[PDB]
Amino acid sequence: ARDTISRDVIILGGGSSGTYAAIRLRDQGKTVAVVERNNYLGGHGETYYTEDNTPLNFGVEGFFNTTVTRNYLERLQVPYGRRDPAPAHEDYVNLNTGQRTEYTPGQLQDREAFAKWVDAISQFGFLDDGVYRIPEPVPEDLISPFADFVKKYHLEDAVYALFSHTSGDVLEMITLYVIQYIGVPHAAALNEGYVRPIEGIAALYKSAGKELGSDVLLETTPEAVQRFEDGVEVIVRSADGTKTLLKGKQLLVTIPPLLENLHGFPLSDQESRLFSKWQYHQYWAALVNDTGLPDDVNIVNVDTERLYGVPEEPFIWRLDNHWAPGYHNIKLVGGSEFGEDEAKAYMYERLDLLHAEGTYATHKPEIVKFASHTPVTMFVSAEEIRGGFYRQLYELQGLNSTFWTGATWASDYSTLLWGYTDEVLDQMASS
Ligand SMILES: *Cc1cc2c(cc1C)nc1c(=O)[nH]c(=O)nc-1n2C[C@H](O)[C@H](O)[C@H](O)COP(=O)(O)OP(=O)(O)OC[C@H]1O[C@@H](n2cnc3c(N)ncnc32)[C@H](O)[C@@H]1O
Ligand SMILES: *[C@@H]1O[C@H](CO)[C@@H](O)[C@H](O)[C@H]1NC(C)=O
Ligand SMILES: *[C@@H]1O[C@H](CO)[C@@H](O)[C@H](O)[C@H]1NC(C)=O
Ligand SMILES: *[C@@H]1O[C@H](CO)[C@@H](O)[C@H](O)[C@H]1NC(C)=O
């Protein structure tokens, strides 16, 4: 084995929440090691740089312009500003049929849709910061099907706009999870405009990586964990085959807590029971070029044969252009079995259909990146929520020196995850 590394906190996953935690902990005077599966920091925060250093973000697009965000970007010395995407006209296209259409009749634009939606969900103020702190008994409207909620709250004209900001088929989701994609802070942020680093989302992670240096272990994963009342041990494995023992006073886990993800990780009966309940979706973030598409179009997917224009999974959620000519992002969402080969084939088939129908002169594109964002939408049934799933989930925090954060534990937006992570760090700093 390599020389044992002892730190105050071992952090599993150097994505958005793990990197934030690392920087915040260091500033608190706690030492860290970050264990990261990939060969880069940032997880869903991904940038491809062209020859002339144009940043092509193909995961995260931006952050909410709040104190938490500004403090962090400023902390890391990262120049930032309002997101200003390349010029584009919107073409409404039914990607399920390959045929051009228009915005669904009766559907509102974002600002007007958000106003009606925010009024309807204001009653769930406990979700204002994206944390699943739900009173029990659970308000039944919160765990009703979104499709039912929009009828009851007279929001039928707002649905497409909400879908457009939710990476999933909203008509098959309960209301809670739609709120956790396009709720109160989310709507405010979109109305104002996101902020992001000038030199790409990856610039944040490059800066953090420079600070953290050898305390980041890239292409490294936990192999065997021991969790004690006062400390942890994590045996990690690196791509070069070396193993390292990490000793921590505490452990912070940003890995999605699917049971299959927690091999080597001892779990209590309660942890095992709760984590057995997860359901999820797959999410693929592609950057393509040589597509035959117009440089100046964003293609907006409207299902003309479905209620409110919302497509059924699997679907292309986004198909938008870039400042660098020829490059497009394609984001695809499906069920838990919508894996890499299925998603690539689906993408190619949708693009081919546009040609077959005479809509665009597409040809098979070049894939620059095809990134897994699976799992997305870690969720449980309405019945589990009614039985206090999220209360029980949060009660897990702190067992045997172990703490958790990330997209499973709070609304899956970097700004909100940073806020929740700070709450977890506060718990970790209890005296
Ligand atoms: C998928 C996605 C997400 C996204 C987005 C667009 C796409 C396509 N647009 C966003 C946006 O514009 N604004 C925003 O704030 N968020 C947006 N998101 C959501 C995104 O998930 C969050 O911003 C955030 O990235 C989630 O943070 P979290 O820390 O929970 O997750 P992560 O970034 O994926 O990082 C997890 C890290 O853990 C590593 N990992 C996984 N398994 C292991 C193991 N076994 N060992 C070690 N490391 C592991 C991952 O590699 C990753 O780095
Ligand atoms: C972000 O918010 C701050 C505080 O409200 C504001 O001063 C600043 O101009 C905003 N930046 C933008 C619009 O990018
Ligand atoms: C936590 O520590 C206690 C005491 O050492 C032990 O009995 C238990 O198995 C541990 N649980 C986990 C999940 O590590
Ligand atoms: C597409 O992108 C790749 C990778 O950046 C580049 O090498 C290639 O020249 C591009 N193709 C076209 C047609 O511009």
Curated annotation (Swiss-Prot):
EC identifiers of the protein: 1.21.99.1
Needed cofactors: FAD
GO molecular function list: beta-cyclopiazonate dehydrogenase activity
Keywords (A to Z) from UniProt: FAD, Flavoprotein, Oxidoreductase, Signal, Virulence
Catalytic reaction(s) noted: beta-cyclopiazonate + A = alpha-cyclopiazonate + AH2
Pfam families in alphabetical order: Amino_oxidase (PF01593)
Top-level EC class: oxidoreductase
UniProt function note: Beta-cyclopiazonate dehydrogenase involved in the synthesis of the fungal neurotoxin alpha-cyclopiazonic acid (CPA). CpaO carries out the dehydrogenation of beta-CPA to yield an unstable enimine product, which is captured by intramolecular cyclization to create the pentacyclic fused scaffold of alpha-cyclopiazonate.
Family: Belongs to the beta-cyclopiazonate dehydrogenase family.
Protein name, per record: Beta-cyclopiazonate dehydrogenase
Gene: cpaO
